[model samples]
Target: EDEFGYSWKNIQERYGTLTGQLHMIELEKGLGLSLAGNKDRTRMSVFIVGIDPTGAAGRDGRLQIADELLEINGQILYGRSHQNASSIIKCAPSKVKIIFIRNADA
Candidate 1:
């Protein structure tokens, strides 16, 4: 998270209806991104908060900040904790197919 409270509250406050443009990309291990979760950990929601400019995601140039990460590989992220969602992303083998929902119309 960008900061302890600020980012938490920011992401936490957005915990509903993620309807928007959707996307999918396959990135290698280290996925090259950062994540944060909305406060409702029971079947919570995690999202992209940052992207490493020189890394896989940035190179793909598709994933954007504030994008709601729906699933990775075949695992749904909404049912997992912030840390657990991150762990699943990290644990993926060399590559992982990640899906997302972008609130902003691109």
Candidate 2:
């Protein structure tokens, strides 16, 4: 019953309206990534410094080691704290929207 391996393109194709069940892995449940952000530490965007090969996000292929996560469930994360960003991910529905930008060559 695990449906958590959709890529960004897959998601857009399947849910182009951007209003459907978007899946992700719970970090505490074995997912992994190292997040970093702006100098002031206010705009806490989740940067993918690493990803577990066996984890959900890694399997999705849309998220990369240098990708910068910008939103979760349609909420803008700019100027938010790490804890706040984590809270959104942790508290999101089983399905949610995640927007991010990857390195040009990534």
Candidate 3:
């Protein structure tokens, strides 16, 4: 995101509030973004493994952690990682955006 030259502080100030799309939410045994770094890059795509035996949900009853917010379901997203870009989609004024970033392996 720094590639755009916008400080995380600025980015947060611009879009970091309840009214904003990217509010912080936490859940147990799931994938989520952890605030490890506040430098605008601390955003992380976390996958809490070890909850299921199959390793992955495998589309079955497996609980997937990541939710792809693609442009807040109807709006535009901002950021690099889908986890980070979700800042826009999660708080999208509409239903919800489904944003996702393909991992290198993906």
Local distance difference test values of all predictions, in order: 0.70, 0.55, 0.32
Per-residue alpha-carbon lDDT of model 2 for 1-106, expressed as tens digits? 1244445675456445532233333222333455666634532245566777776667666566766566665666656665576676767665655666544532
Candidate 1 lDDT, 20-104, residue by residue in tens: 7656666665667788987475432788888999988888888888887876766778856768888888888886776677786
Q: Model 2, residue 19: displacement in angstroms?
A: 26
Candidate 3 lDDT by residue in tens digits, 1-106: 3323344464456545423133222122222332111223323332222234342223233233332222333343433444444354234343222322222222
Worst 10 residues of 1 by lDDT: 1-10
- The collision pairs in model 1 are none
Candidate 1 vs candidate 2: which has greater lDDT? Answer: 1
Please report the candidate that would top TM-score against the real structure.
Answer: 1
**Range of the 10 consecutive residues with the lowest summed lDDT in candidate 3:** 30-39
lDDT of 2 at 73: 59
Model 2: lDDT to the true structure: 0.55
